[PDB]
Design an enzyme around this catalytic site. Structure first.
Site, PDB file in Angstrom:
ATOM      1  N   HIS A   1       0.724 -38.583  56.757  1.00 46.07           N
ATOM      2  CA  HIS A   1       0.577 -38.917  55.877  1.00 46.07           C
ATOM      3  C   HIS A   1       1.231 -39.596  55.339  1.00 46.07           C
ATOM      4  CE1 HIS A   1      -3.180 -35.858  55.567  1.00 46.07           C
ATOM      5  NE2 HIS A   1      -3.611 -36.931  55.677  1.00 46.07           N
TER       6      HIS A   1
ATOM      7  N   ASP B   1       3.725 -37.796  52.907  1.00 48.58           N
ATOM      8  CA  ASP B   1       4.661 -37.215  52.863  1.00 48.58           C
ATOM      9  C   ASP B   1       5.273 -36.968  54.174  1.00 48.58           C
ATOM     10  OD1 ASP B   1       2.888 -35.907  53.928  1.00 48.58           O
ATOM     11  OD2 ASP B   1       2.943 -33.561  52.730  1.00 48.58           O
TER      12      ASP B   1
ATOM     13  N   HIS C   1       5.835 -27.021  52.710  1.00 44.31           N
ATOM     14  CA  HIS C   1       5.897 -26.806  51.026  1.00 44.31           C
ATOM     15  C   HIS C   1       5.447 -26.067  50.059  1.00 44.31           C
ATOM     16  CE1 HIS C   1       3.810 -30.992  51.010  1.00 44.31           C
ATOM     17  NE2 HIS C   1       2.485 -30.760  52.172  1.00 44.31           N
TER      18      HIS C   1
ATOM     19  N   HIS D   1       3.483 -35.997  60.981  1.00 40.47           N
ATOM     20  CA  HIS D   1       1.765 -36.752  60.518  1.00 40.47           C
ATOM     21  C   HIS D   1       1.471 -38.051  60.190  1.00 40.47           C
ATOM     22  CE1 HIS D   1       1.652 -34.572  56.607  1.00 40.47           C
ATOM     23  NE2 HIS D   1       0.916 -34.825  57.170  1.00 40.47           N
TER      24      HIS D   1
ATOM     25  N   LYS E   1       0.331 -23.159  57.041  1.00 39.91           N
ATOM     26  CA  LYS E   1       0.231 -23.484  56.003  1.00 39.91           C
ATOM     27  C   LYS E   1       0.064 -22.299  56.044  1.00 39.91           C
ATOM     28  CE  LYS E   1       0.291 -27.239  54.784  1.00 39.91           C
ATOM     29  NZ  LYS E   1      -1.273 -28.123  54.611  1.00 39.91           N
TER      30      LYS E   1
ATOM     31  N   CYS F   1       2.930 -29.813  57.885  1.00 43.17           N
ATOM     32  CA  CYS F   1       1.715 -29.702  57.658  1.00 43.17           C
ATOM     33  C   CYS F   1       0.831 -28.996  58.101  1.00 43.17           C
ATOM     34  CB  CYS F   1       1.187 -30.944  56.548  1.00 43.17           C
ATOM     35  SG  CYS F   1       2.104 -31.528  55.210  1.00 43.17           S
TER      36      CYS F   1
ATOM     37  N   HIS G   1      -4.894 -29.538  60.215  1.00 44.91           N
ATOM     38  CA  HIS G   1      -4.328 -30.299  58.726  1.00 44.91           C
ATOM     39  C   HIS G   1      -4.468 -31.596  58.775  1.00 44.91           C
ATOM     40  CE1 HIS G   1      -2.555 -31.555  55.570  1.00 44.91           C
ATOM     41  NE2 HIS G   1      -2.190 -32.370  55.975  1.00 44.91           N
TER      42      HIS G   1
ATOM     43  N   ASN H   1      -5.185 -29.385  51.237  1.00 45.84           N
ATOM     44  CA  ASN H   1      -5.878 -30.944  51.457  1.00 45.84           C
ATOM     45  C   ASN H   1      -6.431 -30.895  52.843  1.00 45.84           C
ATOM     46  OD1 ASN H   1      -6.384 -33.198  51.470  1.00 45.84           O
ATOM     47  ND2 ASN H   1      -4.649 -34.485  52.201  1.00 45.84           N
TER      48      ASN H   1
HETATM   49 FE   LIG Z   1      -0.632 -34.109  55.175  1.00 47.56          FE
HETATM   50 ZN   LIG Z   2       1.473 -31.928  53.412  1.00 42.34          ZN
END
Ligand SMILES: [Fe+3]
Ligand SMILES: [Zn+2]
Length: 220
Positions: A77, A79, A195, A75, A159, A156, A137, A165
């Site tokens: 983001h 990270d 994570h 994705h 989850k 991400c 996400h 987030n």
């Molecule tokens: Fe993300």
């Molecule tokens: Zn993340």
């Protein structure tokens, strides 16, 4: 003073790379991605946050006789995409979905050099599959499936303990997306979230439950 990049073998031809960033409020957060071996070649599944850790990651495998053939970001983001700049600058092919690149572009970020679309996309035929379950996400989140090992990298999207987030999340769509994912990869042996620790297929159900719970709480 962030923790050092970590590289640990998970299964035959599959490594987990872990890098860290400071998230104000939640302290230091570990980010897991993979490195997948295809014969004498290596594919990055997500990049570390930084050019520096991306180089360290790349050099670790080059030094062990693997050519880096590409990276795919799950994705937009940072990270997942932090190393795209560095990889592009070394002429290492980078991959992201059309949606991801469009989100990168909108945010003034360097884009992946190669893109794809559709529900299913074979980065490497019969070895590395990218799957788009729908928005969750983020609008663009994809997962990566390794059929030979039955390993799913969830990025991400997975989850199991809480949605995290919600800034770019689609809480209305996540349950449907998560239902689709659980039906697609219910035979997964290992599921690798971004994570938290590796788990089994139960992480798919847990994600669905968190997504359903999140939507219900948003409507009340
Ligand atoms: Fe993300
Ligand atoms: Zn993340």
């Amino acid at each position: 003073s962030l923790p050092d990049l970590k590289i640990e073998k998970l299964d035959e031809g599959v490594y987990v790379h872990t890098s860290f960033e400071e998230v104000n409020g939640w302290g230091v957060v570990p980010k897991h991605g993979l490195v997948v071996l295809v014969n004498a070649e290596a594919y990055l599944i997500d990049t570390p946050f930084t050019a520096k850790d991306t180089e360290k990651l790349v050099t670790w495998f080059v030094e062990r006789g693997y050519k880096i053939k590409g990276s795919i970001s799950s994705h937009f983001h940072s990270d997942s995409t932090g190393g795209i700049e560095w990889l592009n600058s070394r002429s290492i092919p980078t991959y992201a979905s059309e949606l991801t690149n469009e989100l990168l572009k909108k945010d003034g970020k360097v884009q992946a050099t190669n893109s794809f679309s559709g529900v299913n996309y074979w980065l490497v035929k019969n070895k590395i599959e990218v799957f788009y379950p729908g928005p969750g996400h983020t609008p663009d989140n994809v997962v990566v499936w390794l059929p030979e090992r039955k390993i799913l990298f969830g990025g991400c999207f997975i989850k199991p303990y809480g949605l995290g987030n919600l800034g770019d999340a689609n809480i209305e769509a996540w349950p449907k997306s998560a239902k689709l994912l659980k039906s697609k990869y219910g035979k997964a042996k290992l599921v690798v979230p971004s994570h938290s620790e590796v788990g089994d297929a139960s992480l798919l159900k847990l994600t669905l439950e968190q997504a359903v719970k999140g939507l219900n709480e948003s409507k009340k």
